[PDB]
């Protein structure tokens with residue numbers, strides 16, 4: 568006669584840390600599939616997208632200081648940046664300051680290209696070497 | 697070794713797993729975590745237990761039927777006094793408490809629950825199957841088990857808690873230790889099913905449906 572689903576959600580909202588639960592109360596599995604203090608907040612997702620616009624690609628030491636004040640691993644940044652540009656080789660883009668407007672354009676151009684090329688795996692274009 | 701091309705091959709292969717996992721996550725990949733657990737990541741020294749008391753009273757009529765503990769005894773090194781000082785008394789009013797006592801702290805643990813007003817009644821024994829024995833270096837006797845001390849306060853006369861349901865002895869493997877047997881939560885189910893539970897110093901492995909879980913590594 569008690570519903571634990573609702574109970575969890577209500578409890579979760581008051582008690583649960585921000586990243587644990589969603590604004591509706593339920594718990595977000597993104598958090599729990601990322602170890603420890605390694606989960607990637609949507610709020611520092613815009614921070615990577617903001618740093619590529621200001622400092623450019625591969626500027627991670629440059630961009631690490633500004634938007635990820637101390638630590639996010641620079642491996643992570645270059646790995647998410649190939650998420651932003653829809654490509655698995657980000658070599659082509661290095662050192663270029665890219666606007667959020669452009670990044671979005673590059674992403675939809677590399678993805679449509681890789682789908683015609685049939686070189687798209689996991690919404691990321693596979694670039695030949 | 698001809699291994700420059702090797703290393704370039706592991707990198708492009710490894711990134712695609714990241715590009716795979718993050719997409720499945722974006723597409724609603726579920727967690728192992730069951731959907732009805734209530735994880736809380738705090739420091740029991742820095743945590744305010746009135747918030748947990750208000751919220752539980754609020755969305756539930758009740759207070760906790762069961763409390764589980766695995767203190768970080770210092771031998772993550774929490775001061776002994778500090779653990780004793782947690783306001784457990786206020787967290788639960790009628791029911792049972794479980795707390796895992798390493799051999800070093802078995803007597804201290806008994807003092808501790810008695811301090812918090814429980815009456816020691818039972819102890820769970822967990823032997824560690826090779827898969828069928830356990831070799832641990834005791835000072836006086838080798839250790840083949842750790843033990844769960846069980847105290848009780850209030851009216852359990854209620855049908856809410858069911859007597860004579862469960863075992864003393866648990867036989868699980870030493871999974872992933874330091875990690876307790878799952879069939880603890882099976883036993884707690886038998887002892888009292890569909891109840892409000894609490895675990896202190898819990899870890900992500902611990903999280904189960906209906907359980908409020910507090911641990912600094914959540």
Ligand SMILES: C[S@@+](CC[C@H](N)C(=O)[O-])C[C@H]1O[C@@H](n2cnc3c(N)ncnc32)[C@H](O)[C@@H]1O
Pocket residue numbers: 738739740741765766767768772773774874875876897898899901902910911912913
């Ligand atoms: C005995 S272990 C937990 C093992 C647990 N029984 C299990 O089933 O795996 C000690 C736990 O205490 C937690 N802990 C240590 N210091 C803490 C603190 N100051 N506040 C809250 N939790 C703490 C750690 O997260 C660690 O998970």
